[PDB]
């Protein structure tokens, strides 16, 4: 292992470092991860109204980046271009999806096109980082230790303990959303129960069970298949997480999106591969090899030829020059 993983997938949902999900429709900034005795950094996430906007990394006291789906990254308040590499924080784009690496400080963040925060974190902070993605321990039941340090039964007030406010805006205790699903039940539970079920039935998902358990994943979906009207695609967010969670454990899965009738969004020219190398051989590139022994990562990428040049796929013949 030697690593970790958190994920804030879909709408309001969370996945800690230890197999513990819940929902949270926040209202302001909240601390994702970071030390508890002493903080060399702090990954932070801003919610506008339940729905998420920005990932932020405050590197102690002096430096700040505020990336988001908007992609218009900024440093403090001055909007900078992209990519960007100050203070040991390469701010890159991998597989058409945005990345923030802090390997000196022991973390790698990223976002996808839809907006799904992810946080990879070393084994150095085992029993350290206490926050909204919980501690990096082995257990999964005890990873609600509040900013006081208090094992709580509620996955909701916990996330509200780890709030952090600014002068631009002070924020309060958000409220749980009053579910309109409770009255508009109808047929929506009888026909659409299958898309949550196919995590368990289909063979392509029928082999991570000795590594993980889909029982929470199917539990968290059935409450979100009810607000969206007329669509099977409402299941693939909770499903899409289950793919990566098994991938991180050392056991990858293949081609599952072929029949799932849901592919994650990407810009033109590319669609969702699975296990593409991060070192995408592009156009204006030096032909060097056997340095990129990095692990294999998911994300959308170009066709077989059709090399990359400035955020699009273009045929190898039309490689430009530069001056």
């Amino acid at each position: 292992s030697s690593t970790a993983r958190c994920s804030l997938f879909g709408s309001d949902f969370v996945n800690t470092f230890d197999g513990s999900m819940y929902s949270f429709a926040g209202y302001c900034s909240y601390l994702l991860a970071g030390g508890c005795q002493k903080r060399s950094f702090s990954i932070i996430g801003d919610f506008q109204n339940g729905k998420r906007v920005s990932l932020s990394v405050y590197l102690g006291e002096f430096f700040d980046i505020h990336l988001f789906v908007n992609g218009t990254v900024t440093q403090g308040d001055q909007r900078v271009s992209m990519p960007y590499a100050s203070k040991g924080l390469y701010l890159e784009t991998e597989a058409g999806y945005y990345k923030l690496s802090g390997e000196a400080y022991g973390f790698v963040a990223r976002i996808d096109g839809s907006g799904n925060f992810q946080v990879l974190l070393s084994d150095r902070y085992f029993n350290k980082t206490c926050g909204l993605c919980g501690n990096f321990n082995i257990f999964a039941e005890d990873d609600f230790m509040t900013q006081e340090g208090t094992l709580t039964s509620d996955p909701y007030d916990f996330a509200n303990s780890w709030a952090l406010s600014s002068g631009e805006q002070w924020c309060e205790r958000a409220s749980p959303p009053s579910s309109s699903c409770n009255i508009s039940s109808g047929e929506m539970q009888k026909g659409l129960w299958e898309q949550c079920q196919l995590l368990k039935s289909t063979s392509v998902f029928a082999r991570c069970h000795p590594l993980v358990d889909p029982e929470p994943f199917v539990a968290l979906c059935e409450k979100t298949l009810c607000e969206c009207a007329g669509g099977l695609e409402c299941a693939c967010p909770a499903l899409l997480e289950y793919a990566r969670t098994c991938a991180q454990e050392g056991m990858v899965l293949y081609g599952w999106t072929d029949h799932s009738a849901c592919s994650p969004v990407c810009p033109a020219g590319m669609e969702y591969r699975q296990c593409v190398s991060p070192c995408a051989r592009t156009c204006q590139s030096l032909h060097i090899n056997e340095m990129c022994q990095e692990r294999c990562v998911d994300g959308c990428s170009c066709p077989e030829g059709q090399l990359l040049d400035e955020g699009l796929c273009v045929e190898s013949t039309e490689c430009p020059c530069v001056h």
Binding site: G60, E61, F62, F63
Partner: protein, 478 residues
């Protein structure tokens, strides 16, 4: 339910007595002398009247410890704070009342530590009275001064000048060495010990001075005065808030106006009231650099200082570390940083806590240039962490009144039967010393002093320059 343990009893709120000081007022050792709140007791179990609770053990007697530094001390156990012992004779330590030797300092370029203990800020550029005795209604024995030049903004600049006026003398120092301009009458008490980094400098029974050859000025007084002085360091009374008693005999609040009263040249420049802010000139609006100095100033809270962090608060010595090196543009000499921690390390040593914090990537302080003149390389010199300051030499064979226990710096060490001389950089046997023993009695190595001024008839003088077994004749008055 639970039938509580034998040594203590279950108690019950009576319906009549509002004063049900039961379980809520759980007397432990901390709270016994203290007074406690109680609305009503609970369904708990509680030690008897003449007994208490102690870390889950109802300790029988009133012998429980007497906490200092959050640590246990059995009754009769002793501690050493300063120059005093103190023993918890019962539940309360009663300490002695031998007042200890106070100590000024000039931490960095522009700060001052008083006797009673009061860090304050004073960037000056004129010449200033560090301390004196001529204060109101007293004779005026000694008049230590200090003089700075280009030191309102700390930098590689700010060479100090120190002029000390005692016994009608004028000895002064700057640029590495000391200089006598007027020798004082009573040469007997005079003494100079160039041990290590420092210039230890006695002047009498109740006075001493130290100088790190670069900026630090740490005058040391004895029990004798006890409110006989004034100046920048204050009055030496024990009271700490009356160390801003200006020359016009009143307490101020803004120390920049304090020192302006104590300058000598009353027509030179009074310093300017700076707008206060946590960032000096360079660090102002340069938040990046501030955090590289902040972190690097947290050596004052590091694993090696953890013993001294308990005794001596580093929050004073920290604020100076961040104040100087912001202003100071350290380029070739990182001395406006390296000197502030040694000013903390020395104070840690005076409390008996040696520290070795100085490595090769961090303020190295070699000592190898001295083991150079001799073609043979005996190399007896060493940067010893904290070695004694008052040792024996060919120039000063006797044991001296020793105001400072140990000091950092480069120190000689060769095998025994060889005693140091400073002129010949190597150590040497005892007999090679220019020592003097005339008519038997043991004394110094031929001091240049005229003994016996009291009695004319008994004027039996015996000088000794280096070794001479000589005795001069006294000129008669008649």
């Amino acid at each position: 339910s639970l039938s509580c343990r034998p040594p203590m009893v279950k108690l019950v709120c009576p319906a009549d007595n509002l004063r049900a000081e039961g379980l809520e007022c759980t007397k432990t050792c901390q709270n016994y002398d203290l007074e406690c709140m109680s609305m009503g007791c609970v369904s708990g179990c509680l030690c008897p009247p003449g007994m208490v609770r102690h870390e889950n053990r109802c300790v029988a007697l009133e012998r429980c410890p007497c906490f200092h530094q959050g640590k246990e001390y059995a009754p009769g156990e002793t501690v050493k704070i300063g120059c005093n012992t103190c023993v918890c004779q019962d539940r309360k330590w009663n300490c002695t009342d031998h007042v200890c030797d106070a100590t000024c300092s000039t931490i960095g370029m522009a700060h001052y530590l008083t006797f009673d203990g009061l860090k304050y800020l004073f960037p000056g550029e004129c010449q200033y009275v560090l301390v004196q005795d001529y204060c109101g209604s007293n004779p005026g024995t000694f008049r230590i001064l200090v003089g700075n030049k280009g030191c309102s903004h700390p930098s590689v600049k700010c060479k100090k000048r120190v002029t000390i006026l005692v016994e009608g003398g004028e000895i002064e120092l700057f640029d590495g060495e000391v200089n006598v301009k007027r020798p004082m009458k009573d040469e007997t008490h005079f003494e100079v010990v160039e041990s290590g980094r420092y210039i230890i400098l006695l002047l009498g029974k109740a006075l001493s001075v130290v100088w790190d050859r670069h900026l630090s000025i740490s005058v040391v007084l004895k029990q004798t005065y006890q409110e006989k002085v004034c100046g920048l360091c204050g009055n030496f009374d024990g009271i700490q808030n009356n160390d801003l008693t200006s020359s016009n005999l009143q307490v101020e609040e803004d120390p920049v106006d304090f020192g302006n009263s104590w300058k000598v040249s009353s027509q030179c420049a009074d310093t300017r009231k700076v707008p206060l802010d946590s960032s000096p000139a360079t660090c102002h609006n340069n938040i990046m650099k501030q955090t590289m100095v902040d972190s690097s100033c947290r050596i004052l809270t590091s694993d090696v200082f953890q013993d001294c962090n308990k005794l001596v608060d580093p929050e004073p010595y920290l604020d100076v570390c961040i104040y100087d090196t912001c202003s100071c543009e350290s380029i070739g000499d990182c001395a406006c940083f390296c000197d502030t921690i040694a000013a903390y390390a020395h104070v840690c040593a005076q409390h008996g806590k040696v520290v070795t914090w100085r490595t090769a990537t961090l303020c190295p302080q070699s000592c190898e240039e001295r083991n150079l003149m001799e073609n043979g390389y005996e190399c007896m010199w060493r940067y010893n962490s904290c070695a004694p300051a008052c040792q024996v030499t060919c120039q000063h064979p006797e044991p001296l009144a020793c105001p400072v226990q140990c000091v950092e710096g480069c120190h000689a060490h060769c095998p025994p039967g060889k005693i140091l001389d400073e002129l010949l950089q190597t150590c040497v046997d005892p007999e090679d010393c220019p020592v003097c023993e005339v008519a038997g009695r043991r004394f110094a190595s031929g001091k240049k002093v005229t003994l016996n001024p009291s009695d004319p008839e008994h004027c039996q003088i015996c000088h000794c320059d280096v070794v001479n077994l000589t005795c001069e004749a006294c000129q008669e008055p008649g």
